[PDB]
C-alpha cells in the first residue's frame, strides 16, 4: 500500500496472507469469507507469462496477522489448502478479466478478536454502494512505493467513474472490474501496490453497519501514479460463480 497508514489491531480481521512455503515469502493478500473459504485474485495463483502456477501444497494461508514478518504466536492461525478453484474464464492472456479464485482450507479456522469473516455483497448492497465518489478501504502488506511495511497497511480510496477508468489506460476494461483512486487534481493520494494483490477492497454499509467486500486488488500501472488508478475485481458480478463453487464443494 502506498500513502496508507498502519492498520489498527483487529481493524481487518478477514485479512489473509498467502504465504509461499519454499522459499518462505509473502505471495499475495486474500480474505476470509467463512470458516473454510478464502477469496483471492486468480493471478496470485496462476500467471503463465511468468511461469506462475501454484498447487495447494505450495502455499499456506496466515490468518489473524498484523506484523508482516513476525510469527504472531497465540494470535495468527496458519491453515493448509484443501483445494484451489480458479474462475474457469479467468483471462490471464489479455486483461485479467475475472481475476478471482477461491481456496478451501483443510480444516475450519477458529474465529477470534483477530480472525473474523467479511460479508459478500448482495445486489442491492452493491447497487447502493458501488458509486463514483463513494470510498472503500484497501489493506495489505505490499510495497510502500513503486520498502516493505512493518505492519498491515490501510488506505481509503474513492470509486472512480467508469469512463475515467477506461480513459486512464490502454488495457481493455470490463464490467468485471472497477477502478479506485484520487484524481490528480483531488490532492490526496494512495493506491495498492505489488504484494497487495488478492487483498480486499471493503466498504462499510451505512444500512446495517457491516463490512462488505466489493473488490479484490487486481492490477495497476505502477503504484500511486498521477492519472492512474488501481483496478479491482468486481466481486458482486462474480458472486454466482462463488456460490456455485461453495454450493458444490462445501
Amino acid at each position: 500500500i502506498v500513502e496508507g497508514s498502519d492498520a489498527e489491531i483487529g481493524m481487518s480481521p478477514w485479512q489473509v496472507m498467502l504465504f509461499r512455503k519454499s522459499p518462505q515469502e509473502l505471495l499475495c493478500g486474500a480474505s476470509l469469507i467463512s470458516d473454510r473459504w478464502v477469496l483471492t485474485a486468480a493471478h496470485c495463483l496462476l500467471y503463465p507469462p511468468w511461469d506462475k502456477n501454484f498447487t495447494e501444497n505450495d502455499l499456506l494461508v496466515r490468518i489473524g496477522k498484523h506484523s508482516r514478518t513476525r510469527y504472531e504466536r497465540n494470535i495468527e492461525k496458519i491453515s493448509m489448502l484443501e483445494k484451489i478453484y480458479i474462475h474457469p474464464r479467468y483471462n490471464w492472456r489479455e486483461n485479467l478479466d475475472r481475476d478471482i479464485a477461491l481456496m478451501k482450507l483443510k480444516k475450519p479456522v477458529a474465529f477470534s478478536d483477530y480472525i473474523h469473516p467479511v460479508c459478500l455483497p448482495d445486489r442491492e448492497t452493491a447497487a447502493s454502494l458501488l458509486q463514483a465518489g463513494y470510498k472503500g478501504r484497501v489493506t495489505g502488506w505490499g510495497n510502500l512505493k513503486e520498502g516493505q511495511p512493518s505492519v498491515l497497511q490501510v488506505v481509503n480510496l474513492p470509486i472512480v467513474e467508469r469512463p475515467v477508468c477506461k480513459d486512464s489506460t490502454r488495457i481493455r476494461i470490463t464490467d468485471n472490474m472497477f477502478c479506485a483512486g484520487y484524481k490528480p487534481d483531488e490532492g490526496k493520494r494512495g493506491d495498492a501496490c505489488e504484494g497487495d494483490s488478492g487483498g480486499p477492497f471493503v466498504m462499510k454499509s451505512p444500512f446495517n453497519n457491516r463490512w462488505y467486500q466489493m473488490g479484490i486488488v487486481s492490477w495497476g500501472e505502477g503504484c500511486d501514479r498521477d492519472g492512474k488508478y488501481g483496478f479491482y475485481t468486481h466481486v458482486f458480478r462474480l458472486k454466482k460463480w462463488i456460490q456455485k463453487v461453495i454450493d458444490q464443494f462445501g
Binding site: 504465504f19 512455503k21 518462505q24 514478518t69 510469527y71 496458519i78
Partner: peptide, 11 residues
C-alpha cells in the same frame, strides 16, 4: 526476512 513459522505447519 520472515521469522520461521512452527515446524508443524511445514510438515
Amino acid at each position: 526476512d520472515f521469522e520461521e513459522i512452527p515446524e508443524e505447519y511445514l510438515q
